[PDB]
Amino acid sequence: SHTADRWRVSLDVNHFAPDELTVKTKDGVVEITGKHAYISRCFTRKYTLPPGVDPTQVSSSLSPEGTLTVEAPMPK
Template sequence: GKHEERKDEHGFVSRTFTRKYSLPSAANVEKVTSSLSPEGFLTIEAPLIRPAIQSSEVTIPVTADNKG
């Protein structure tokens, strides 16, 4: 975060800060978003990567015995 630079009686005041958060291993890091509200609340959204859905269908070949 960064606060706007402002002037006071001694010169200019500027403030910045950094914060690191650990994300779940299933988080899609390419789609992480963050926003800061006017009240100062930081919201971070990290959607989870959905595993590929495995089909429960199995194809079984059928052979025909042409005997009798």
């Protein structure tokens, strides 16, 4: 009654200009990695999920401007 909460974060990935991004969810942590390539450049950024989030329901999208949005349904 009557709320559908979401966890959501966004990353400006334009400057890094990844050749590939990976979004991995495990042990209540979301790990985002980018690789660009020498010189090869690599970054890793981690987020702690709120308690109760189902790892299979974490999704992401990359906008043409180079912003990566990652999100997931909140348990309750």
